[PDB]
């Protein structure tokens, strides 16, 4: 357990995912707004725009991606995107974070024109992961490890994005044998959220349709990293 | 195409 160039891996990790990003001004708004479909709509659409800025910074401080072809480094972001957004969001209603402002940005999501057919799965997923009890740890390497995923769509280098990857994969399993020798099945229950976190990715699309022929408005960096035409 | 990702990147 923990070799030098592992140890040093993480810590500059940690220091990335600890960068208080998200600005205490936008997030009060969970709070303090209006509780409408609309209102509820565009401060979710806010929060996300906002996220989308601390994940391509996140992104920029992980280990080796900027060494990687410029194609390659929007692929990875467009495709990681939405999975990054379940994972702190997640976070948020897990860990029962102050800043997420858990009970009523759950109110939100519930009531913002997204069908039932997405709502039972999305929250069917927070609760069960929320039962793992991660850490920060775990859940800012998974993070790293979901944007760093060669399998995305339209990606060229592969092999050079798995180069990347690899080191966190090894990295989290360590920290499962160390910190949970009680059960090794640790690891695989970690990764078994990657997969999880696909299948709404895929539905994700839909969602979007649904708001977009509602005359629904995102930004116009939100379109970009998800093709809203 | 697809601009402001590549202008947050060099920023
Ligand atoms: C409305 C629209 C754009 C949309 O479409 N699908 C989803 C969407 C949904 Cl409804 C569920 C899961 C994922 C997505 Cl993308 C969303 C809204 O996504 C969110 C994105 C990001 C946050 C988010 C991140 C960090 C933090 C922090 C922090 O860092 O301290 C404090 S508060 C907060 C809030 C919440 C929601």
Redesign the pocket.
Known sequence: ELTPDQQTLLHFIMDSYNK???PQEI?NK?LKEEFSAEEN?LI??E???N?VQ?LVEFTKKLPGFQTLDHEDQIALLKGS??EA??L??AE?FNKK?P???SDL?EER?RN?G?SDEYITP?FSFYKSIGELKMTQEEYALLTAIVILSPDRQYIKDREAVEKLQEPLLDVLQKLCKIHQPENPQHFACLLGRLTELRT?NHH?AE??MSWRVNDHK?TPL?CEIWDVQ | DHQLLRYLLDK
């Open positions: 208080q990003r998200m997030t969970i709509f979710l659409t929060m996300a725009t996220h601390v995107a939405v957004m379940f702190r969001s948020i974070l800043s997420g402002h940005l999501i913002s997204i999305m709404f994700h969602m979007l995102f939100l």
